[PDB]
Symmetry: D2
């Protein structure tokens, strides 16, 4: 699936609808990024610029101008077509094709932006600008405004009001359209397939990075070339390290491996975690911790729906975790008192859920303690985990165990839709999947 020309147009108009008359919104592309010396990382467009354009070049600026409540138009600054520069550094859209391709009224060369931007802003009352997002963008905007302020003899005037559009745009991004949900649906599926493959390929004696290799190959073959974030493959005690991305250890018989990986498909993030035994067989101790995390996930999946919140669902998970840990002798005391003193926190130190979209930790207001009431169209993760340090003062058999299970969901009218349930998570289904693969 993909985003249509008409959708990009609808988004631009939804922003313009919220703008004051006599205003302009400026949305800048991401700069290119050095990896080492003259080599650059694969280009990643700014999510907000992408959201309004689907255009994957640097040195571009979308300018939306609202004259009044009926009249508005768009100007794109982008790199010019150059025979030599493209033979070398790849094809460029240019100014002639841009209006039709990207649905903008006017396209100008980015090399002319300082000569042109101030003319577009002259006489307007408001400029919408994400100040501080990029230094190169702030320089450009500040120069334009300075030319206008100081140009009274040339009959120039600067808009006195500057408004950050990020709160408005991020509120838009928080609610997914049907097109976006279909894309995320595909991202979840591609990501699930990768996690299934990793489970099937896994053997003791491989390195953690081998499973990363399988995962990335799977992303790529469905047309999702890049991960949405750096892949985590934490086996044994590496599973207790939340942002373990070294993936440098040999996977040992008797250890669990925690895999957190997600593709980026048409700009949108998948985000799945699965934890499973390297040898295809949960031990009793591993199973005992796993069940607590699974129950937490399964219960959260039942509960998530409009009218509740991440805070509220989290409270239920905490109860499950504390009860489970008390039954295993990992915690000692009264469940309610332990809950009151957040006794689970040494073992579950992160949030249960984050928004998901064009960024893996997506934009949008959470409310205090993530108390915002959920509504249809919100997309989020559900990712309970339990991490028992190698030196934790608990029954010895639980030490050095890190387990997280994470799905991606969209809130619907009546509940939620799980976008990542096509990869197994019940322990017996994990074992059966692995057995079958090892036959073959």
């Amino acid at each position: 699936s993909e985003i249509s020309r008409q959708e990009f147009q609808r988004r631009r108009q939804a922003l313009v609808e919220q703008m004051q008359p006599g205003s302009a919104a400026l949305i800048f592309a991401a700069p290119e990024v050095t990896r080492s010396a003259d080599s650059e990382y694969p280009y990643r467009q700014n999510s907000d610029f992408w959201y309004f354009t689907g255009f994957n070049e640097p040195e571009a600026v979308l300018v939306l101008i609202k004259s009044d409540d009926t009249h508005n138009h768009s100007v794109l600054f982008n790199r010019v077509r150059d025979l030599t520069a493209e033979i070398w550094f790849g094809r460029r859209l240019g100014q002639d094709a841009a209006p039709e391709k990207l649905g903008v009224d006017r396209a100008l060369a980015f090399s002319e932006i300082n000569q042109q931007l101030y003319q577009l802003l002259n006489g307007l009352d408001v400029v919408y600008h994400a100040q501080g997002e990029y230094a190169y963008a702030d320089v450009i905007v500040n120069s334009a405004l300075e030319k206008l302020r100081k140009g009274s003899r040339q009959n120039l005037t600067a808009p006195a009001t500057m408004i950050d559009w990020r709160p408005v745009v991020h509120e838009m991004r928080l609610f997914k359209s049907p097109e976006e949900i279909a894309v995320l649906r595909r991202a979840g599926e591609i990501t699930a397939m990768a996690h299934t493959r990793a489970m099937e390929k896994c053997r003791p004696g491989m390195f953690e990075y081998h499973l990363e290799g399988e995962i990335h190959h799977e992303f790529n073959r469905h047309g999702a070339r890049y991960p949405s974030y750096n892949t985590i493959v934490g086996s044994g005690e590496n599973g207790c390290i939340l942002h373990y991305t070294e993936n440098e250890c040999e996977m040992r018989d008797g250890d669990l491996v925690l895999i957190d990986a997600g593709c980026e498909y048409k700009g949108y993030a998948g985000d799945i975690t699965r934890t499973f035994p390297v040898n295809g067989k949960f031990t009793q101790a591993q199973r005992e911790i796993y069940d607590i995390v699974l129950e937490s996930l399964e219960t959260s999946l039942r509960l998530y729906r409009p009218g509740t919140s991440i805070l509220e669902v989290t409270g239920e998970v905490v109860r499950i975790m504390v009860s489970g840990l008390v039954k295993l002798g990992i915690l000692k005391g009264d469940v309610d008192e332990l809950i009151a003193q957040n006794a689970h926190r040494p073992f579950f130190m992160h949030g249960l859920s984050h928004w998901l979209g064009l960024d893996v930790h997506d934009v949008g207001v959470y409310g205090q303690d993530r108390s915002r009431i959920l509504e249809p169209g919100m997309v989020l993760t559900v990712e309970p985990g339990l991490y028992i340090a190698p030196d934790a003062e608990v029954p010895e058999q639980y030490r050095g165990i890190g387990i997280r299970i994470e799905d991606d969901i969209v809130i619907t009218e009546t509940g939620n839709e799980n976008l990542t349930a096509s990869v197994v998570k019940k322990p017996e289904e994990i074992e059966a999947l692995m057995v079958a693969a090892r036959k073959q």
Copy 2:
């Protein structure tokens, strides 16, 4: 293959040997790099910092202090061990383990660098610093020097002399040690295996990015997790675009595909290009252009040795190219006159060779027009190509053809060693490789 602890030590001492007495050299780690919002790209250490340390963390600074011709020592600034911060953002070496691990005399917390660096530079005559390399580094160094200049009442003095160490260090990097050649040999082998795999897997109807996928999987399984540069898979008319990395087209029966891909193994770059038919069989027209490029490569491989230059070998390649293009009717006229007017340029617009090492386009002085005399230990690519535009005024059968063949070599006492010859390039061998895989 790997770089030993002793090697890193040798390199540090080789720099210190070239430093003035009463001086300090400051070598800064690369910053972390945003991909989107709060997510970052996989960390890539600064090549120069890596060269002296093999240490893969940001927010670190290596300080080499030379008191005099016999006395020198090292101070590392790096991130402190933090229980919480590491549970989250991965393990850190810290200050206790660093001396032994990285062979430095002293390790200090990076958070203390502004409180400590000026004290280390106080009273020295010279500071070696790569000014302009990173803005965060310049801020730190300038603050230290300012404190010193303005601190006369506190008996502080700033070194008046600042020297850019990059010329010295890059001249070091230009000559590979045996350990480095062994690592580059492994990178060449890993890279060659990936290119072989791509040729064997290729079928019409796959997309260009599928071959990129095969290639990266191969890099990964030998322990080279990242490419050294963005992979090019340009099929058909995409072959004529030199930095084509979109790799977004369906590969079609009848087209050639040009693959330029290289792994990064222990920091060192492989860099191979192979061009081959998507359907496993060169057409006559494809073969006619391919042979010119292959002769150019094979001749260059015979010629490269100490005492010649990239400029000199390039002159031979140009003659091969012009002669071949005249035979095919792509160029018209007298070969020498065509050569004199660089008539090949529309078809071969880039250099024949670049240095290779910790960066794919490696550091080191080339000389004017790459005329520097070659010596043993230099590592470079050999990559002739011909690129005929879709709308070129030439016979139709040559339009939209892009062919490059690239190997990595090391200059030896008497010649060169080819590090990437384990992937085939003779057209008959390419065809046979593909036929065998398709059985």
Copy 3:
């Protein structure tokens, strides 16, 4: 005369009245300014900061907070009292005395501004800030806003709207109160006395800078320690150079000297120009040019009143100049055609009038071509001039003559009040003044 505590309070309230509810205005002091190495120029407060405070220290910030249409309050950031630092670098108001002295509700140490400003801006909808005025101020404001934007987990929010207050404040400054007019009245008088003295002291053989010395001594003895701008004493051919401040030549018998000088009194600028013969006696040629400039001034003084404009009065002056120059053979042709082609411009290349106040070239919107309609309370200069280059192609006797005559006026209900008429400008009165002094 001076500005009262109550006036500074009225000004702050007039700004607050124009502010949106749930907003804060930030007004920063001027930085100290290096003259050479560790020595600094005499401190000059930012005119806008001065306007709301009458406070002459650097490292201070006035913060006006409007909660709603009835509730507002003020916070001052200023330097703390320090025993040692003051023994050295002079007395400081400090935090204890500031509320009563400057009429602010709260005073905080400037050293704490980064720890405190964001707390003041937290949860507001609008911040008023003169972006680009000072780099140190922009750093402070941008840091505060960045802390708020990124502080959602700490329940912080940044105002999304930033408004430049300069247009509003400069519009306030354009209309002088009675207190301000009384101060400007005194500045005009002090400045007039200085120009009278210069005429009386002038002898051939003195250097231009000697008259500058007399002028500055006169400013100082009335308590106006500093000029409002760099003093011009251009004798002979130096008179044709508009911003001649070298004042390095010996004044010659037979030359004119053009003196443009003004005091700064309680922050307000005087701005007078007088031109006169070094030897106390206008020649015929000098008199012929002088009369044209004088008629221009005298006519402009009759005309200035509410309902006209600088543009309109300028048109009358141009006619006077062109007619006069044609009569002398400096211009040749039809007066109306010469006027149509702006034939006067080689000889009068600057504006007739600028606003005057806390800055010599004062703030306030002029309108296109200075066409804004004049209203009571506006204060401006009237300064026709004629400058004939040494190499100008005109009758030889006029070459190298530079004459300007400048008064300061305030627009009243019925006309204007000339604040600087106490120094003579009629040629015979200049001559008589000089004769009397030479007896011385």
Copy 4:
């Protein structure tokens, strides 16, 4: 007195003599400085730029190029001649007149500096630059060096070595030539005349700023248009505030007034302090403190010579101060023990002497605690003072008294010459001067 063309030339050559071959020194003019909105303060040239040029324009850069031990030349960047811009903003030297006027081999437009500077630095080994002095200068220099570093394909190379010339130049400035001593002699005389005038004009009921007015008028009439620093006129309890420049109080019968004021003449600073009674007659209490300060000055004037130091002479002054304060009951105890515990510090908190020249607090290395051995040609102030706070726990009659007496001297082969002794400092002579003026 004035600095000749030949002197400026000598200074440039003295710098070039100390430069390495294959180097360039870059000396930047001061920027213009805003007073309020579009109005600027009177321009003050950078002292170092002035030292080598005597040129009083902004947007100028002196470039001294040393090819080798015999060959060197100079390039000036300065503002172009512009008919319109000068009619408005005053005359400019321009490019045609500059070679002859300023004795430079070549003059270029400042507008072309970014297009030209890199070409001048290309291929040199060393660039001398005062990094951090001005932001606009650093931008220019860094841009040039960047162009050079990145311009290898255009056969450009950057000098790898950057040296701060300030230590060398400031060491030059520390030793005055005969021409400079003659100019400083004139500045001392002009300044002394102004202080004499202030004493003669002073009456109770005038404000402190009226004496500032007299002083500046005097500076001006001898052709010293600007003070070298902001004038201090601290009467009564304002005398105890070291950098009192408000000068806003009415001067009262019974009080002392402390006047610290100095002219700037041809760039060089006078720096005189005199303290005297507003009513022309010292009280006993005033005289008792005054005598201690005067003895301190007079003794210092006898002692200063080559071979001693500011530290050494200061030690004698401290003994004089402590002894005197003990006699008056301001300090209590054993003189040596009081000296050992620096018991004078509450009353004399600043240094006895600072270097003097193109800056009032002039450049040059002092040594630790100002222990550097004095040599002929050094110019410095001698300024003992005693400042007793209004709330000091001492006998009442000494509270709120601030007295400083300051002269400017030059060290000679055998001693010193006092450049400011033409204004009186003995209390009887001050009184007689004031009595005579009041007749």
